[PDB]
Amino acid sequence: GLIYAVGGYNNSPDGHTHLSSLEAYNPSTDTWSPVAPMSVPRSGVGVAVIDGLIYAVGGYDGHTHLNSVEAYDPETDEWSLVAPMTTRRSGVGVAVLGGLIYAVGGYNNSPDGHTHLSSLEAYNPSTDTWSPVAPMSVPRSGVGVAVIDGLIYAVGGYDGHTHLNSVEAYDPETDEWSLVAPMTTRRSGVGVAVLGGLIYAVGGYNNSPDGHTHLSSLEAYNPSTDTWSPVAPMSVPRSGVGVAVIDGLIYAVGGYDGHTHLNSVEAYDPETDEWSLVAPMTTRRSGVGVAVL
C-alpha cells in the first residue's frame, strides 16, 4: 500500500499556486515520488478509493470551484474524467460506503453567490451517475468525513459563520442524518481517520474571543459510548491537512500551520500515543487530499 497526496495549495516556488500534481509515499522505504498529474489543479479536493482507482472530487482550480471528477489508475499512471457532480464543491468531504462515493458539503460561489453547503450526493461507478440524497443538519465546508459501522460521519467544518464542533452520522439505508456527540474542540479544515474502532479528528482551525488558531490537537471518538477524548497532539498545527491510515498508523500529511504550507508528514501510533516524523513530501501542500491504495 502507498499513500497518495493529491493536489493542494502552496506559495513555493510560486505564490498562490493551486496544484494538479500527485506524489506517492512508500512506507517500506520512507520515500515520496511523483506520479502523473491531474487534468486540472485542485485544492480543497476530496479523494476516494474504490475499484482500485483514486477519485479526485471537486476542489478549486485557482479560479473556479469544481464539479468535475477524475479517476487515477496506478497500474497505468493515468487519469480519466468521469461524470461531474451536480453541485460544484471545494472544501468537500468524500466517503466510500456500500460501493458508492459520497460528496459531503463543501463551498462554491457559482450558482447562488458565496455558498457553504449542507447537501450530499452519491456516485455509483457502475452507472457513472451522481444522485442527490438527504442533506445534513447544517452547512459544512472544510468538513472531515469518516466511515465506520455502515455510517458516514461528518465531523466539524465551517457553516459560513461558525467553526463547528458538531458531528452527525448518515445511514444510507434510511437516508437520514442524526447528530452524535460534538467534539470538545471546534475544528474546520479538519482531517479524519478511522482506526481501531475509533474516529480521530486531526488538527483543524477555529476562532476564539482571543483570535483564530490552527490546531495540533487530536481527539478520538468512541462510538460505543458516544464520547470524545483527547489524545497526543502533533508536532505542528495542521489545518487543511490530509490523513491516511495504513498498517495501524495514522499519517498526517501537509496542511497549513498559520504561517507555512507544510511538506512535513508525521505518523501516530495509538498503542504508544506518540507521533513520529517521517519523510517530507517533495511539494508543500495545504488543502490536500490523501488516499491509500
Domain ranges, ordered by start, for the chain: 3-292
- What is the number of H-type helices and E-type strands within the chain? 0, 30
Angle at 48 (CA atoms; ends 280, 45), nearest 5 degrees = 65
Q: Is 178 helix (H, G, I), strand (E, B) or coil?
A: strand
The sheet carrying 249-253 orders its strands as 242-246, 249-253, 265-269, 274-278
- Short-list 208, 213, 218, 217, CA closest to 259: 213
Distances (CA, A) of 143 to 35, 86, 164: 27, 19, 9
Torsion of CA 192, 194, 197, 203, to 10 degrees: -30
172/116 Cα distance (integer angstroms): 23
- Short-list 268, 267, 260, 266, CA closest to 285: 260
Strands, DSSP E only, in 69-166? 69-73, 78-82, 93-97, 100-104, 107-108, 115-116, 120-124, 129-133, 144-148, 151-155
The sheet carrying 167-171 orders its strands as 144-148, 151-155, 167-171, 176-179
227/31 Cα distance (integer angstroms): 37
Burial grade of 216 (CB within 10 A; 0-12, 13-18, 19 or more): buried
| CB 264 within 8 Å of CB 278 | no
95/195 Cα distance (integer angstroms): 15
| CB 284 within 8 Å of CB 263 | yes
64/154 Cα distance (integer angstroms): 24
267/4 Cα distance (integer angstroms): 15
For residue 13, is the peptide bond before it cis, meaning its omega torsion is within 30 degrees of 0?
A: yes
| CB 143 within 8 Å of CB 155 | yes
- Short-list 27, 28, 9, 49, CA closest to 266: 27
Beta partners for residue 53, in sequence order: 50
CB count, 10 Å around CB of 96?
Answer: 18
- Short-list 81, 90, 82, 73, CA closest to 36: 73
Q: Is 44 helix (H, G, I), strand (E, B) or coil?
A: coil
37/191 Cα distance (integer angstroms): 23
| CB 91 within 8 Å of CB 105 | yes
State the DSSP H helix or E strand holding residue 193, giving kind and residue range, or none if neither. strand 191-195
- Short-list 46, 56, 41, 52, CA closest to 10: 41
Query: Positive or negative CA dihedral for 201, 171, 130, 115?
Result: negative
> Could you tell me the three cell numbers for 268?
501516530
Query: Positive or negative CA dihedral for 245, 5, 161, 84?
Result: negative
Q: Which residues contact 217 (CB under 8 A, 6 or more apart)?
A: 185, 203, 230, 233, 234
Beta partners for residue 277, in sequence order: 266
Residue type, 109: N
Residue type, 9: Y
For 3-292, which CATH superfamily applies? Kelch-type beta propeller (2.120.10.80)
Q: Is 163 helix (H, G, I), strand (E, B) or coil?
A: strand
Q: Which residues contact 164 (CB under 8 A, 6 or more apart)?
A: 138, 140, 156, 157, 158, 186, 187, 188
Residue type, 44: G
- Short-list 109, 122, 209, 215, CA closest to 171: 122
Question: Helices in 7-98 by DSSP H: which ranges?
Answer: none
Q: Which residues contact 85 (CB under 8 A, 6 or more apart)?
A: 57, 58, 67, 68, 69, 103, 121, 123, 130
Experimental approach taken:
X-ray
